[PDB]
Tab-separated table of N, CA, C and O in Angstrom:
chain	number	residue	atom	x	y	z
A	7	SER	N	61.448	-82.833	-4.825
A	7	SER	CA	60.711	-83.334	-3.666
A	7	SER	C	60.668	-82.311	-2.546
A	7	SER	O	59.623	-82.121	-1.917
A	8	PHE	N	61.810	-81.667	-2.286
A	8	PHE	CA	61.891	-80.645	-1.248
A	8	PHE	C	61.744	-79.225	-1.789
A	8	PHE	O	61.582	-78.300	-0.996
A	9	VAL	N	61.828	-79.017	-3.103
A	9	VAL	CA	61.653	-77.673	-3.636
A	9	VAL	C	60.296	-77.117	-3.230
A	9	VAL	O	59.281	-77.834	-3.205
A	10	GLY	N	60.276	-75.816	-2.937
A	10	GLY	CA	59.068	-75.109	-2.620
A	10	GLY	C	58.498	-75.434	-1.269
A	10	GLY	O	57.438	-74.918	-0.929
A	11	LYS	N	59.158	-76.276	-0.490
A	11	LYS	CA	58.757	-76.509	0.885
A	11	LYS	C	59.522	-75.550	1.791
A	11	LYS	O	60.714	-75.307	1.594
A	12	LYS	N	58.822	-74.999	2.766
A	12	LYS	CA	59.344	-74.053	3.714
A	12	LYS	C	59.511	-74.643	5.096
A	12	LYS	O	58.612	-75.206	5.667
A	13	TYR	N	60.711	-74.521	5.601
A	13	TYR	CA	61.071	-75.079	6.861
A	13	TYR	C	61.461	-73.961	7.819
A	13	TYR	O	62.111	-73.059	7.438
A	14	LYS	N	61.034	-74.038	9.045
A	14	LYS	CA	61.424	-73.105	10.054
A	14	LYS	C	62.261	-73.761	11.156
A	14	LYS	O	61.989	-74.864	11.559
A	15	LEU	N	63.255	-73.051	11.644
A	15	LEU	CA	64.126	-73.595	12.681
A	15	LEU	C	63.338	-74.087	13.902
A	15	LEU	O	62.559	-73.348	14.499
A	16	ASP	N	63.598	-75.325	14.304
A	16	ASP	CA	63.016	-75.911	15.507
A	16	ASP	C	64.027	-76.124	16.620
A	16	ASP	O	63.729	-75.829	17.782
A	17	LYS	N	65.251	-76.548	16.289
A	17	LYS	CA	66.269	-76.820	17.290
A	17	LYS	C	67.652	-76.569	16.701
A	17	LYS	O	67.859	-76.696	15.500
A	18	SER	N	68.610	-76.243	17.555
A	18	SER	CA	69.944	-75.945	17.060
A	18	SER	C	70.958	-76.297	18.137
A	18	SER	O	70.734	-76.044	19.324
A	19	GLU	N	72.076	-76.871	17.715
A	19	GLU	CA	73.201	-77.110	18.611
A	19	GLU	C	74.460	-76.547	17.985
A	19	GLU	O	74.724	-76.782	16.802
A	20	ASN	N	75.199	-75.758	18.761
A	20	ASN	CA	76.538	-75.286	18.395
A	20	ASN	C	76.540	-74.217	17.317
A	20	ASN	O	77.576	-73.996	16.683
A	21	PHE	N	75.423	-73.527	17.075
A	21	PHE	CA	75.472	-72.480	16.065
A	21	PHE	C	76.284	-71.292	16.553
A	21	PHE	O	76.992	-70.666	15.758
A	22	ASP	N	76.229	-70.973	17.849
A	22	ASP	CA	77.077	-69.889	18.346
A	22	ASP	C	78.546	-70.177	18.051
A	22	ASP	O	79.274	-69.306	17.556
A	23	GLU	N	78.996	-71.406	18.332
A	23	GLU	CA	80.396	-71.754	18.087
A	23	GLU	C	80.727	-71.708	16.597
A	23	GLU	O	81.803	-71.233	16.216
A	24	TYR	N	79.815	-72.196	15.740
A	24	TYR	CA	80.034	-72.109	14.301
A	24	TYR	C	80.222	-70.656	13.871
A	24	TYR	O	81.174	-70.316	13.155
A	25	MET	N	79.319	-69.777	14.291
A	25	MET	CA	79.455	-68.372	13.930
A	25	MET	C	80.726	-67.763	14.502
A	25	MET	O	81.410	-66.984	13.827
A	26	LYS	N	81.059	-68.091	15.744
A	26	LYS	CA	82.262	-67.508	16.339
A	26	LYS	C	83.502	-67.925	15.541
A	26	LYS	O	84.344	-67.092	15.172
A	27	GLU	N	83.582	-69.200	15.187
A	27	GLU	CA	84.719	-69.683	14.410
A	27	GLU	C	84.741	-69.067	13.011
A	27	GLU	O	85.812	-68.719	12.489
A	28	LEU	N	83.568	-68.843	12.435
A	28	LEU	CA	83.448	-68.179	11.146
A	28	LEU	C	83.876	-66.716	11.216
A	28	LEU	O	84.197	-66.119	10.188
A	29	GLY	N	83.922	-66.135	12.402
A	29	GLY	CA	84.363	-64.777	12.546
A	29	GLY	C	83.245	-63.765	12.718
A	29	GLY	O	83.477	-62.569	12.510
A	30	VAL	N	82.038	-64.210	13.046
A	30	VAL	CA	80.933	-63.280	13.189
A	30	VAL	C	81.112	-62.494	14.486
A	30	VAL	O	81.519	-63.042	15.513
A	31	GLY	N	80.880	-61.192	14.410
A	31	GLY	CA	81.041	-60.333	15.564
A	31	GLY	C	80.057	-60.637	16.679
A	31	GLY	O	79.017	-61.295	16.508
A	32	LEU	N	80.417	-60.122	17.855
A	32	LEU	CA	79.735	-60.486	19.098
A	32	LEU	C	78.242	-60.198	19.028
A	32	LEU	O	77.426	-61.069	19.334
A	33	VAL	N	77.862	-58.992	18.600
A	33	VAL	CA	76.444	-58.622	18.588
A	33	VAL	C	75.682	-59.406	17.523
A	33	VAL	O	74.581	-59.908	17.769
A	34	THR	N	76.229	-59.491	16.312
A	34	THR	CA	75.546	-60.241	15.263
A	34	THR	C	75.353	-61.681	15.675
A	34	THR	O	74.269	-62.260	15.506
A	35	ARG	N	76.381	-62.238	16.294
A	35	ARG	CA	76.390	-63.622	16.729
A	35	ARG	C	75.318	-63.871	17.790
A	35	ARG	O	74.547	-64.842	17.708
A	36	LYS	N	75.254	-63.008	18.801
A	36	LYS	CA	74.213	-63.161	19.819
A	36	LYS	C	72.821	-62.953	19.230
A	36	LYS	O	71.897	-63.689	19.570
A	37	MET	N	72.663	-62.001	18.303
A	37	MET	CA	71.384	-61.835	17.606
A	37	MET	C	71.044	-63.089	16.803
A	37	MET	O	69.919	-63.596	16.860
A	38	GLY	N	72.013	-63.600	16.042
A	38	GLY	CA	71.760	-64.759	15.196
A	38	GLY	C	71.381	-65.999	15.977
A	38	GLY	O	70.586	-66.818	15.512
A	39	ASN	N	71.965	-66.164	17.162
A	39	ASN	CA	71.644	-67.277	18.047
A	39	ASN	C	70.161	-67.382	18.345
A	39	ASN	O	69.626	-68.488	18.493
A	40	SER	N	69.484	-66.256	18.478
A	40	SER	CA	68.128	-66.288	19.004
A	40	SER	C	67.069	-66.251	17.915
A	40	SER	O	65.881	-66.436	18.218
A	41	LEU	N	67.473	-66.103	16.653
A	41	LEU	CA	66.516	-66.092	15.555
A	41	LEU	C	66.000	-67.498	15.245
A	41	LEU	O	66.594	-68.515	15.621
A	42	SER	N	64.858	-67.538	14.558
A	42	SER	CA	64.234	-68.780	14.101
A	42	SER	C	63.942	-68.659	12.614
A	42	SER	O	62.777	-68.588	12.206
A	43	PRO	N	64.976	-68.678	11.771
A	43	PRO	CA	64.767	-68.433	10.338
A	43	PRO	C	64.068	-69.579	9.637
A	43	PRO	O	64.025	-70.716	10.121
A	44	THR	N	63.551	-69.261	8.451
A	44	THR	CA	63.015	-70.259	7.533
A	44	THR	C	63.980	-70.488	6.385
A	44	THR	O	64.750	-69.590	6.005
A	45	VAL	N	63.961	-71.719	5.871
A	45	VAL	CA	64.705	-72.126	4.692
A	45	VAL	C	63.738	-72.675	3.652
A	45	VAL	O	62.872	-73.501	3.965
A	46	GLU	N	63.943	-72.267	2.407
A	46	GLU	CA	63.189	-72.775	1.276
A	46	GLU	C	64.062	-72.789	0.040
A	46	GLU	O	64.686	-71.775	-0.292
A	47	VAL	N	64.067	-73.921	-0.657
A	47	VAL	CA	64.762	-74.062	-1.929
A	47	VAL	C	63.713	-74.038	-3.028
A	47	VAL	O	62.732	-74.778	-2.974
A	48	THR	N	63.901	-73.172	-4.001
A	48	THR	CA	63.024	-73.080	-5.143
A	48	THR	C	63.869	-73.285	-6.382
A	48	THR	O	65.100	-73.250	-6.336
A	49	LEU	N	63.199	-73.543	-7.498
A	49	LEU	CA	63.895	-73.787	-8.745
A	49	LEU	C	63.095	-73.203	-9.900
A	49	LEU	O	61.867	-73.326	-9.940
A	50	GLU	N	63.801	-72.566	-10.832
A	50	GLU	CA	63.211	-72.190	-12.111
A	50	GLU	C	64.196	-72.487	-13.220
A	50	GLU	O	65.325	-71.985	-13.221
A	51	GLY	N	63.759	-73.312	-14.160
A	51	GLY	CA	64.643	-73.839	-15.172
A	51	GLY	C	65.869	-74.515	-14.595
A	51	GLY	O	65.776	-75.548	-13.926
A	52	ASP	N	67.023	-73.919	-14.869
A	52	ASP	CA	68.327	-74.400	-14.448
A	52	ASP	C	68.744	-73.864	-13.076
A	52	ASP	O	69.716	-74.358	-12.492
A	53	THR	N	68.045	-72.867	-12.554
A	53	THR	CA	68.582	-72.038	-11.492
A	53	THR	C	67.835	-72.274	-10.190
A	53	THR	O	66.622	-72.042	-10.098
A	54	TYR	N	68.577	-72.751	-9.200
A	54	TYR	CA	68.093	-72.907	-7.842
A	54	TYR	C	68.217	-71.583	-7.093
A	54	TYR	O	69.110	-70.780	-7.372
A	55	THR	N	67.311	-71.363	-6.136
A	55	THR	CA	67.444	-70.287	-5.154
A	55	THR	C	67.267	-70.878	-3.758
A	55	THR	O	66.256	-71.540	-3.478
A	56	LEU	N	68.264	-70.658	-2.897
A	56	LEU	CA	68.227	-71.072	-1.502
A	56	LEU	C	67.930	-69.816	-0.681
A	56	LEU	O	68.745	-68.881	-0.656
A	57	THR	N	66.769	-69.776	-0.042
A	57	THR	CA	66.299	-68.581	0.645
A	57	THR	C	66.209	-68.862	2.132
A	57	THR	O	65.412	-69.697	2.574
A	58	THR	N	67.027	-68.151	2.896
A	58	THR	CA	67.009	-68.186	4.348
A	58	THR	C	66.518	-66.825	4.823
A	58	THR	O	67.094	-65.792	4.470
A	59	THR	N	65.421	-66.813	5.569
A	59	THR	CA	64.735	-65.589	5.916
A	59	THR	C	64.633	-65.462	7.426
A	59	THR	O	64.123	-66.365	8.095
A	60	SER	N	65.130	-64.354	7.951
A	60	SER	CA	64.923	-63.984	9.346
A	60	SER	C	64.097	-62.708	9.370
A	60	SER	O	63.845	-62.099	8.325
A	61	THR	N	63.675	-62.295	10.572
A	61	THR	CA	62.910	-61.056	10.693
A	61	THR	C	63.712	-59.841	10.288
A	61	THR	O	63.117	-58.808	9.982
A	62	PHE	N	65.037	-59.940	10.265
A	62	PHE	CA	65.873	-58.824	9.865
A	62	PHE	C	66.218	-58.793	8.374
A	62	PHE	O	66.296	-57.704	7.793
A	63	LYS	N	66.435	-59.945	7.741
A	63	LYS	CA	67.079	-59.995	6.429
A	63	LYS	C	66.704	-61.291	5.710
A	63	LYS	O	66.543	-62.337	6.346
A	64	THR	N	66.616	-61.227	4.384
A	64	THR	CA	66.517	-62.413	3.537
A	64	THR	C	67.830	-62.604	2.794
A	64	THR	O	68.335	-61.666	2.161
A	65	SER	N	68.389	-63.801	2.901
A	65	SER	CA	69.522	-64.234	2.089
A	65	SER	C	68.978	-65.209	1.048
A	65	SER	O	68.608	-66.345	1.370
A	66	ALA	N	68.858	-64.729	-0.188
A	66	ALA	CA	68.345	-65.526	-1.295
A	66	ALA	C	69.470	-65.621	-2.311
A	66	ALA	O	69.823	-64.630	-2.968
A	67	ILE	N	70.081	-66.786	-2.392
A	67	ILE	CA	71.228	-66.990	-3.268
A	67	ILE	C	70.819	-67.949	-4.379
A	67	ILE	O	70.304	-69.044	-4.121
A	68	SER	N	71.082	-67.543	-5.604
A	68	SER	CA	70.700	-68.295	-6.786
A	68	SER	C	71.962	-68.938	-7.339
A	68	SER	O	73.056	-68.373	-7.219
A	69	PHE	N	71.815	-70.154	-7.857
A	69	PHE	CA	72.964	-70.945	-8.277
A	69	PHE	C	72.486	-72.069	-9.186
A	69	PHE	O	71.315	-72.452	-9.150
A	70	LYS	N	73.399	-72.526	-10.052
A	70	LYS	CA	73.227	-73.743	-10.836
A	70	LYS	C	73.965	-74.836	-10.078
A	70	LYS	O	75.105	-74.625	-9.648
A	71	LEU	N	73.297	-75.960	-9.854
A	71	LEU	CA	73.967	-77.075	-9.204
A	71	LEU	C	75.248	-77.386	-9.943
A	71	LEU	O	75.310	-77.271	-11.169
A	72	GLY	N	76.279	-77.736	-9.169
A	72	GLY	CA	77.558	-78.171	-9.683
A	72	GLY	C	78.314	-77.138	-10.466
A	72	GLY	O	79.248	-77.495	-11.189
A	73	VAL	N	77.937	-75.865	-10.357
A	73	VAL	CA	78.653	-74.776	-11.007
A	73	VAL	C	79.147	-73.830	-9.932
A	73	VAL	O	78.350	-73.229	-9.199
A	74	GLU	N	80.434	-73.654	-9.881
A	74	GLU	CA	81.079	-72.829	-8.906
A	74	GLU	C	80.658	-71.396	-9.060
A	74	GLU	O	80.488	-70.941	-10.139
A	75	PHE	N	80.425	-70.763	-7.934
A	75	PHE	CA	80.041	-69.358	-7.818
A	75	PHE	C	80.675	-68.599	-6.660
A	75	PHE	O	81.159	-69.174	-5.778
A	76	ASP	N	80.633	-67.285	-6.741
A	76	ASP	CA	81.072	-66.389	-5.695
A	76	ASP	C	79.925	-66.011	-4.724
A	76	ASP	O	78.840	-65.711	-5.169
A	77	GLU	N	80.215	-66.041	-3.417
A	77	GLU	CA	79.220	-65.959	-2.351
A	77	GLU	C	79.771	-65.090	-1.216
A	77	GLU	O	80.953	-65.195	-0.871
A	78	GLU	N	78.918	-64.242	-0.631
A	78	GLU	CA	79.262	-63.526	0.598
A	78	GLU	C	79.049	-64.409	1.817
A	78	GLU	O	78.032	-65.093	1.923
A	79	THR	N	80.002	-64.377	2.752
A	79	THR	CA	79.854	-65.104	4.011
A	79	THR	C	79.240	-64.216	5.099
A	79	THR	O	79.210	-62.983	5.004
A	80	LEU	N	78.781	-64.866	6.169
A	80	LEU	CA	78.246	-64.120	7.302
A	80	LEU	C	79.262	-63.132	7.851
A	80	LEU	O	78.893	-62.028	8.269
A	81	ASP	N	80.549	-63.519	7.900
A	81	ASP	CA	81.527	-62.593	8.440
A	81	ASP	C	82.013	-61.561	7.426
A	81	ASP	O	82.900	-60.788	7.765
A	82	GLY	N	81.467	-61.510	6.212
A	82	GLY	CA	81.799	-60.436	5.284
A	82	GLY	C	82.891	-60.716	4.273
A	82	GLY	O	83.533	-59.772	3.812
A	83	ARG	N	83.132	-61.972	3.910
A	83	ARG	CA	84.107	-62.302	2.890
A	83	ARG	C	83.384	-62.751	1.632
A	83	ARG	O	82.240	-63.195	1.667
A	84	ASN	N	84.075	-62.607	0.512
A	84	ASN	CA	83.664	-63.167	-0.763
A	84	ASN	C	84.446	-64.459	-0.970
A	84	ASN	O	85.676	-64.439	-0.915
A	85	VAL	N	83.741	-65.580	-1.179
A	85	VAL	CA	84.389	-66.868	-1.353
A	85	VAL	C	83.770	-67.569	-2.547
A	85	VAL	O	82.636	-67.291	-2.934
A	86	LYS	N	84.537	-68.501	-3.123
A	86	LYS	CA	84.024	-69.438	-4.114
A	86	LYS	C	83.263	-70.557	-3.412
A	86	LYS	O	83.733	-71.106	-2.412
A	87	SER	N	82.090	-70.891	-3.934
A	87	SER	CA	81.279	-71.967	-3.393
A	87	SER	C	80.776	-72.855	-4.522
A	87	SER	O	80.691	-72.447	-5.692
A	88	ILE	N	80.346	-74.049	-4.145
A	88	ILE	CA	79.686	-74.936	-5.091
A	88	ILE	C	78.660	-75.746	-4.321
A	88	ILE	O	78.840	-76.050	-3.136
A	89	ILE	N	77.532	-75.999	-4.958
A	89	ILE	CA	76.435	-76.723	-4.333
A	89	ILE	C	76.094	-77.897	-5.236
A	89	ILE	O	75.966	-77.734	-6.457
A	90	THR	N	76.015	-79.084	-4.644
A	90	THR	CA	75.763	-80.297	-5.383
A	90	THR	C	74.641	-81.053	-4.696
A	90	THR	O	74.269	-80.772	-3.548
A	91	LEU	N	74.091	-82.018	-5.422
A	91	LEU	CA	72.922	-82.749	-4.973
A	91	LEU	C	73.176	-84.237	-5.145
A	91	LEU	O	73.619	-84.676	-6.212
A	92	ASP	N	72.886	-85.011	-4.096
A	92	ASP	CA	73.069	-86.466	-4.130
A	92	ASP	C	71.846	-87.031	-3.420
A	92	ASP	O	71.803	-87.115	-2.192
A	93	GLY	N	70.833	-87.378	-4.196
A	93	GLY	CA	69.595	-87.821	-3.591
A	93	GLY	C	68.861	-86.684	-2.912
A	93	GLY	O	68.496	-85.698	-3.562
A	94	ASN	N	68.630	-86.817	-1.607
A	94	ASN	CA	67.987	-85.790	-0.794
A	94	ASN	C	68.985	-84.922	-0.037
A	94	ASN	O	68.569	-84.158	0.840
A	95	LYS	N	70.288	-85.070	-0.309
A	95	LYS	CA	71.335	-84.309	0.368
A	95	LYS	C	71.854	-83.215	-0.543
A	95	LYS	O	72.510	-83.492	-1.557
A	96	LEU	N	71.619	-81.980	-0.147
A	96	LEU	CA	72.163	-80.833	-0.836
A	96	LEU	C	73.398	-80.345	-0.069
A	96	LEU	O	73.279	-79.886	1.080
A	97	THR	N	74.570	-80.427	-0.710
A	97	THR	CA	75.859	-80.109	-0.093
A	97	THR	C	76.440	-78.837	-0.687
A	97	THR	O	76.649	-78.739	-1.904
A	98	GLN	N	76.747	-77.905	0.195
A	98	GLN	CA	77.392	-76.649	-0.115
A	98	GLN	C	78.801	-76.642	0.479
A	98	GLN	O	78.990	-76.892	1.678
A	99	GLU	N	79.776	-76.355	-0.355
A	99	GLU	CA	81.171	-76.226	0.050
A	99	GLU	C	81.578	-74.783	-0.135
A	99	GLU	O	81.351	-74.219	-1.207
A	100	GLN	N	82.219	-74.203	0.868
A	100	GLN	CA	82.873	-72.918	0.707
A	100	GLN	C	84.383	-73.085	0.762
A	100	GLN	O	84.914	-73.654	1.716
A	101	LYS	N	85.059	-72.581	-0.265
A	101	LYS	CA	86.507	-72.523	-0.301
A	101	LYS	C	86.979	-71.244	0.378
A	101	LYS	O	86.191	-70.470	0.904
A	102	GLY	N	88.278	-71.015	0.365
A	102	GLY	CA	88.856	-69.821	0.948
A	102	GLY	C	89.502	-70.135	2.277
A	102	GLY	O	89.780	-71.290	2.602
A	103	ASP	N	89.768	-69.086	3.049
A	103	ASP	CA	90.574	-69.273	4.253
A	103	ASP	C	89.739	-69.628	5.492
A	103	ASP	O	90.308	-69.789	6.581
A	104	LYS	N	88.427	-69.831	5.348
A	104	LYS	CA	87.605	-70.427	6.404
A	104	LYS	C	86.706	-71.471	5.767
A	104	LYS	O	85.481	-71.290	5.662
A	105	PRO	N	87.300	-72.590	5.332
A	105	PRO	CA	86.535	-73.590	4.579
A	105	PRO	C	85.432	-74.211	5.419
A	105	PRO	O	85.613	-74.510	6.601
A	106	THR	N	84.276	-74.395	4.790
A	106	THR	CA	83.078	-74.860	5.482
A	106	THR	C	82.278	-75.765	4.558
A	106	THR	O	82.252	-75.569	3.345
A	107	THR	N	81.611	-76.745	5.150
A	107	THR	CA	80.620	-77.556	4.463
A	107	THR	C	79.276	-77.363	5.153
A	107	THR	O	79.210	-77.371	6.385
A	108	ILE	N	78.211	-77.190	4.370
A	108	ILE	CA	76.858	-77.087	4.890
A	108	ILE	C	76.033	-78.137	4.158
A	108	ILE	O	75.780	-78.022	2.946
A	109	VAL	N	75.632	-79.169	4.881
A	109	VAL	CA	74.896	-80.276	4.288
A	109	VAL	C	73.451	-80.138	4.719
A	109	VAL	O	73.149	-80.100	5.920
A	110	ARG	N	72.568	-80.065	3.745
A	110	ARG	CA	71.148	-79.943	3.984
A	110	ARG	C	70.478	-81.230	3.512
A	110	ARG	O	70.417	-81.514	2.307
A	111	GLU	N	70.033	-82.025	4.467
A	111	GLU	CA	69.357	-83.287	4.193
A	111	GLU	C	67.866	-83.106	4.407
A	111	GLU	O	67.417	-82.900	5.534
A	112	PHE	N	67.097	-83.203	3.357
A	112	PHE	CA	65.666	-83.130	3.452
A	112	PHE	C	65.063	-84.516	3.583
A	112	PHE	O	65.280	-85.348	2.782
A	113	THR	N	64.254	-84.717	4.575
A	113	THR	CA	63.728	-86.013	4.919
A	113	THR	C	62.337	-86.306	4.361
A	113	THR	O	61.637	-87.195	4.864
A	114	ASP	N	61.919	-85.554	3.344
A	114	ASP	CA	60.570	-85.101	3.215
A	114	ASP	C	60.487	-84.086	4.357
A	114	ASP	O	61.294	-83.075	4.357
A	115	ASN	N	59.599	-84.318	5.343
A	115	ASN	CA	59.099	-83.218	6.155
A	115	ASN	C	59.961	-82.437	7.114
A	115	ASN	O	59.463	-81.530	7.713
A	116	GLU	N	61.197	-82.820	7.318
A	116	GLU	CA	62.111	-81.974	8.014
A	116	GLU	C	63.403	-81.787	7.269
A	116	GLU	O	63.653	-82.455	6.317
A	117	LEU	N	64.109	-80.749	7.655
A	117	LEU	CA	65.414	-80.423	7.141
A	117	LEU	C	66.421	-80.478	8.247
A	117	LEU	O	66.268	-79.845	9.231
A	118	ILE	N	67.459	-81.249	8.011
A	118	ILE	CA	68.561	-81.386	8.939
A	118	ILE	C	69.786	-80.785	8.270
A	118	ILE	O	70.240	-81.269	7.228
A	119	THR	N	70.310	-79.727	8.866
A	119	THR	CA	71.419	-78.975	8.305
A	119	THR	C	72.608	-79.210	9.223
A	119	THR	O	72.534	-78.940	10.430
A	120	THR	N	73.678	-79.749	8.660
A	120	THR	CA	74.928	-79.952	9.377
A	120	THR	C	75.963	-78.984	8.826
A	120	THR	O	76.249	-78.993	7.621
A	121	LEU	N	76.512	-78.145	9.706
A	121	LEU	CA	77.459	-77.110	9.307
A	121	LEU	C	78.780	-77.423	9.983
A	121	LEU	O	78.811	-77.656	11.200
A	122	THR	N	79.855	-77.465	9.197
A	122	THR	CA	81.184	-77.823	9.702
A	122	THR	C	82.180	-76.731	9.354
A	122	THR	O	82.261	-76.321	8.198
A	123	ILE	N	82.912	-76.252	10.359
A	123	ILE	CA	84.032	-75.337	10.188
A	123	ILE	C	85.068	-75.706	11.254
A	123	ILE	O	84.717	-75.910	12.421
A	124	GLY	N	86.327	-75.859	10.847
A	124	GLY	CA	87.334	-76.347	11.780
A	124	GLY	C	86.861	-77.599	12.501
A	124	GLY	O	86.446	-78.588	11.890
A	125	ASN	N	86.888	-77.567	13.825
A	125	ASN	CA	86.491	-78.722	14.606
A	125	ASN	C	85.073	-78.599	15.135
A	125	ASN	O	84.667	-79.404	15.976
A	126	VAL	N	84.315	-77.633	14.623
A	126	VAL	CA	82.959	-77.316	15.052
A	126	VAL	C	81.993	-78.046	14.118
A	126	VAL	O	82.086	-77.904	12.893
A	127	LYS	N	81.070	-78.826	14.676
A	127	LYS	CA	79.917	-79.322	13.935
A	127	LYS	C	78.688	-78.678	14.540
A	127	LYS	O	78.478	-78.760	15.746
A	128	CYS	N	77.911	-77.999	13.720
A	128	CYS	CA	76.643	-77.445	14.141
A	128	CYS	C	75.520	-78.246	13.490
A	128	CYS	O	75.602	-78.580	12.300
A	129	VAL	N	74.472	-78.561	14.261
A	129	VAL	CA	73.303	-79.262	13.723
A	129	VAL	C	72.072	-78.407	13.971
A	129	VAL	O	71.788	-78.021	15.106
A	130	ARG	N	71.382	-78.120	12.910
A	130	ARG	CA	70.185	-77.372	12.933
A	130	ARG	C	69.072	-78.107	12.211
A	130	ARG	O	69.171	-78.516	11.116
A	131	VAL	N	67.999	-78.251	12.935
A	131	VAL	CA	66.826	-78.943	12.488
A	131	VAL	C	65.672	-77.972	12.277
A	131	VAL	O	65.341	-77.230	13.138
A	132	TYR	N	65.123	-78.041	11.087
A	132	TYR	CA	63.998	-77.268	10.642
A	132	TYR	C	62.823	-78.163	10.235
A	132	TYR	O	62.996	-79.157	9.622
A	133	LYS	N	61.631	-77.729	10.560
A	133	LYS	CA	60.410	-78.449	10.225
A	133	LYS	C	59.451	-77.624	9.354
A	133	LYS	O	59.348	-76.441	9.479
A	134	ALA	N	58.806	-78.316	8.438
A	134	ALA	CA	57.811	-77.739	7.543
A	134	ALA	C	56.680	-77.019	8.274
A	134	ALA	O	56.527	-77.145	9.491
């Protein structure tokens, strides 16, 4: 239902704090605050690709749902992650020493992304 739909950032709360807690450096963090990236989930056969695109960089990560994989974090660590699907909610868990959950709820026409690290909840809303 949400595959192949492209969403662009419309509003964000607490992303600076999420990045700071994640360990992102001062300049990257201030740059990241002001970007308006797009998100798109695509699928071919068994393999999903979650593509987040800013004017500087594309992060396109491919994964099989419910199969654990290794992932680079924004602050430069390699962590084990797993992504699962429950209806319209795509949930990403990162293990390791900065555990995080990123829940992407597609409403049909908008995407609501809730990012949790420590006591920080970030909410980012993207629209088609």
